[PDB]
Design a protein around this ligand. Sequence first.
Ligand SMILES: *[C@@H]1O[C@H](CO)[C@@H](O[C@@H]2O[C@H](CO)[C@@H](O[C@@H]3O[C@H](CO[C@H]4O[C@H](CO)[C@@H](O)[C@H](O)[C@@H]4O)[C@@H](O)[C@H](O)[C@@H]3O)[C@H](O)[C@H]2NC(C)=O)[C@H](O)[C@H]1NC(C)=O
Ligand SMILES: *[C@@H]1O[C@H](CO[C@@H]2O[C@@H](C)[C@@H](O)[C@@H](O)[C@@H]2O)[C@@H](O[C@@H]2O[C@H](CO)[C@@H](O[C@@H]3O[C@H](CO)[C@@H](O)[C@H](O)[C@@H]3O)[C@H](O)[C@H]2NC(C)=O)[C@H](O)[C@H]1NC(C)=O
Ligand SMILES: *[C@@H]1O[C@H](CO)[C@@H](O[C@@H]2O[C@H](CO)[C@@H](O)[C@H](O)[C@H]2NC(C)=O)[C@H](O)[C@H]1NC(C)=O
Ligand SMILES: *[C@@H]1O[C@H](CO)[C@@H](O[C@@H]2O[C@H](CO)[C@@H](O)[C@H](O)[C@H]2NC(C)=O)[C@H](O)[C@H]1NC(C)=O
Ligand SMILES: *[C@@H]1O[C@H](CO)[C@@H](O[C@@H]2O[C@H](CO)[C@@H](O)[C@H](O)[C@H]2NC(C)=O)[C@H](O)[C@H]1NC(C)=O
Ligand SMILES: *[C@@H]1O[C@H](CO)[C@@H](O[C@@H]2O[C@H](CO)[C@@H](O)[C@H](O)[C@H]2NC(C)=O)[C@H](O)[C@H]1NC(C)=O
Ligand SMILES: *[C@@H]1O[C@H](CO)[C@@H](O[C@@H]2O[C@H](CO)[C@@H](O)[C@H](O)[C@H]2NC(C)=O)[C@H](O)[C@H]1NC(C)=O
Ligand SMILES: *[C@@H]1O[C@H](CO)[C@@H](O)[C@H](O)[C@H]1NC(C)=O
Lengths: 276, 277
Amino acid sequence: WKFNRTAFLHQRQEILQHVDVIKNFSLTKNSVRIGQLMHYDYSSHKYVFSISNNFRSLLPDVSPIMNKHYNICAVVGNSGILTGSQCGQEIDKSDFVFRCNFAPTEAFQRDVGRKTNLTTFNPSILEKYYNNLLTIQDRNNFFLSLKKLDGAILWIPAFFFHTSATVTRTLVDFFVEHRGQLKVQLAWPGNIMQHVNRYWKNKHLSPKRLSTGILMYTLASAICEEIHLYGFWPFGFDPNTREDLPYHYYDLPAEFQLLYRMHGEGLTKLTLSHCA
Amino acid sequence: KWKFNRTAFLHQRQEILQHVDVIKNFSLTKNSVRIGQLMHYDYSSHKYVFSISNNFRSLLPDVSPIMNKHYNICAVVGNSGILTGSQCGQEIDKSDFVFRCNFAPTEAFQRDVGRKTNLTTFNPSILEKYYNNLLTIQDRNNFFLSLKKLDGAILWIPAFFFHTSATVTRTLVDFFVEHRGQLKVQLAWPGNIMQHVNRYWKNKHLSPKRLSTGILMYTLASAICEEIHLYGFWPFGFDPNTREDLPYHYYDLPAEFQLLYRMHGEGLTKLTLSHCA
Ligand SMILES: *[C@@H]1O[C@H](CO)[C@@H](O[C@@H]2O[C@H](CO)[C@@H](O[C@@H]3O[C@H](CO[C@H]4O[C@H](CO)[C@@H](O)[C@H](O)[C@@H]4O)[C@@H](O)[C@H](O)[C@@H]3O)[C@H](O)[C@H]2NC(C)=O)[C@H](O)[C@H]1NC(C)=O
Ligand SMILES: *[C@@H]1O[C@H](CO[C@@H]2O[C@@H](C)[C@@H](O)[C@@H](O)[C@@H]2O)[C@@H](O[C@@H]2O[C@H](CO)[C@@H](O[C@@H]3O[C@H](CO)[C@@H](O)[C@H](O)[C@@H]3O)[C@H](O)[C@H]2NC(C)=O)[C@H](O)[C@H]1NC(C)=O
Ligand SMILES: *[C@@H]1O[C@H](CO)[C@@H](O[C@@H]2O[C@H](CO)[C@@H](O)[C@H](O)[C@H]2NC(C)=O)[C@H](O)[C@H]1NC(C)=O
Ligand SMILES: *[C@@H]1O[C@H](CO)[C@@H](O[C@@H]2O[C@H](CO)[C@@H](O)[C@H](O)[C@H]2NC(C)=O)[C@H](O)[C@H]1NC(C)=O
Ligand SMILES: *[C@@H]1O[C@H](CO)[C@@H](O[C@@H]2O[C@H](CO)[C@@H](O)[C@H](O)[C@H]2NC(C)=O)[C@H](O)[C@H]1NC(C)=O
Ligand SMILES: *[C@@H]1O[C@H](CO)[C@@H](O[C@@H]2O[C@H](CO)[C@@H](O)[C@H](O)[C@H]2NC(C)=O)[C@H](O)[C@H]1NC(C)=O
Ligand SMILES: *[C@@H]1O[C@H](CO)[C@@H](O[C@@H]2O[C@H](CO)[C@@H](O)[C@H](O)[C@H]2NC(C)=O)[C@H](O)[C@H]1NC(C)=O
Ligand SMILES: *[C@@H]1O[C@H](CO)[C@@H](O)[C@H](O)[C@H]1NC(C)=O
């Protein structure tokens, strides 16, 4: 695989033509009004969410990625293809590492690495893994997870699904209460998937719901000189051994075809094999 | 026929108020909680908590809404189907002060239940069941319109009875902060009070792991009413005079009712189980 820097910078210019990535990355204090009604990107337009004093107080003053430039970025998905890959060292060598859905690293360091600079957080994760922060034990566990992220950006898409509404109110309340006690940088994208989906429409990727991986590649494109993908592999067998794989390392086929095409054209390095 | 025994009632009142500080228990107040304080739920495992936000606290009253209030005749109106066809409306509205349970509707049922409302209770689960969690403009407007019709009534919201109220409390709180100043409704939010209430009534032979909103209502009423009349308390699905079937609720626990019937017997209160004059 050889990196084609000119093709990549060209892809970047095309992306930024269709998506104002720095702006789209997160709402800012002055980009919303108290009382404003947000709609949900992937839900009926009739669903709304009112912006409280408190939600707004949790937004950044300027985009967390304004004037940031990193040389090598790793974007790490959650496929089982990472299990036994020993990609840990190669991933941690990167200048900036994106991860998906609050994925765990402590017990998987050798394969996925421990360095984290941005991680995505669907608010449904409170419900599934932290019991809606209903007990002291859960509130402490959540606090502790967030402390381990140090100064990483936590990218919370609250306005994708209307089913994230009630949990958004629990998160917001938790973050206000613990204001000043965490170095984690919150980022809250608004209604951005129409604009993101337009760029990728012209590259014949269609689907109902664009994946977090393609979305990550899109952000990464604005701030990384060179993107390497790890853990993107939708199928439940290994591509070299053909032995079975766990669906996720810690236990869509249209998207992956596209990334493999891009790997072919030297835009990015998709890694599907053991590292060391 | 029923005769009011005023001396027996005033005796019951003095006994209640000796064991329950009703005026205090009625609602938390701004200065009675701290931002960050963890509330527990009276009828749930002690492990469940709710943190008091800036916003929750801003919605509490500065003093108890029933401090130094005294009414002559109080009606306490439950929701049993026994009210259907009863024409109790006029007798209920004649009262000086009317308590109602669980945001019960009156517009379509005036002749039987009355229209006058001075306090109504509100389990926050009602947002999920009838207002779709305030998720749409239509639901937010419907809720706003219901609250506007209560004018200056107290809305008594027991947020800390069941842990399953937690998420919907956060939706209410947010709704009320957003609409601050636009409603004359007087919010009241009782804290952890059922230990103290249930202990007075333990010695009167009523046990349960959940006390009923009606007994709770009688307890509050006792602190501010000279004479209490109960309407719509009747747990069974048949009429006591005709024996024909009844809807469970007029708008569609047996231990508690036994107790209220005993009290009716002793002239403390008038339980009404029949058509009104
Ligand atoms: C609802 O009304 C209640 C009165 O019916 C309020 O209860 C009072 O609340 C205060 C503040 O929490 C308590 O003050 C404490 O007093 C005890 C004294 O020991 C007592 O132990 C039990 C009480 O259950 C009993 O044996 C005697 O009352 C004893 O005197 C101290 O340990 C504390 O430091 C503190 O000063 C009152 O004791 C308490 N009264 C009763 C009868 O329990 C209650 O706070 C109200 N709740 C709300 C939300 O308004
Ligand atoms: C940004 O990163 C690029 C590319 O870095 C390369 O690939 C990464 C994924 C990692 O594996 C890196 O370890 C690896 O360097 C950097 O460009 C590279 O710079 C180095 C010099 O530091 C170049 O190597 C030299 O080449 C000359 C002539 O061929 C030799 O005489 C030298 O001894 C030495 O080997 C290399 O050509 C160049 N690589 C590419 C693909 O262009 C870049 O330095 C870095 N920038 C910053 C500011 O960090
Ligand atoms: C995401 O960026 C898009 C694209 O730049 C923004 O869409 C523009 O919004 C402006 C308002 O400032 C419109 O007048 C432009 O016509 C839009 N341009 C395009 C190409 O659609 C959008 O505001 C951004 N969304 C967020 C949440 O930041
Ligand atoms: C990207 O994230 C990692 C956190 O995982 C940052 O690396 C840490 O930097 C601190 C502060 O100097 C060190 O004390 C830690 O030992 C580093 N941890 C690891 C795991 O390497 C890194 O600095 C961040 N980089 C950028 C550009 O934000
Ligand atoms: C009203 O109720 C009171 C209290 O229950 C009655 O007064 C008691 O009457 C009994 C006789 O059955 C006496 O032995 C008690 O000493 C009285 N109690 C007190 C505290 O004085 C009263 O009789 C009732 N009135 C009516 C009309 O039934
Ligand atoms: C409290 O209300 C009662 C009930 O209406 C009042 O006493 C009654 O007064 C009416 C008419 O004024 C009479 O027809 C009843 O026969 C009375 N009943 C009894 C048992 O005395 C009482 O005066 C009211 N007190 C107030 C307004 O202070
Ligand atoms: C109890 O509630 C009713 C409202 O349900 C109050 O009665 C209203 O009072 C206003 C202003 O005094 C009148 O203009 C309305 O016509 C009355 N409505 C009804 C239905 O009677 C009553 O004042 C309240 N009682 C209190 C606070 O003691
Ligand atoms: C990528 O670089 C090659 C040289 O490797 C160049 O000729 C080509 O035009 C670039 N872009 C595309 C789209 O192939």
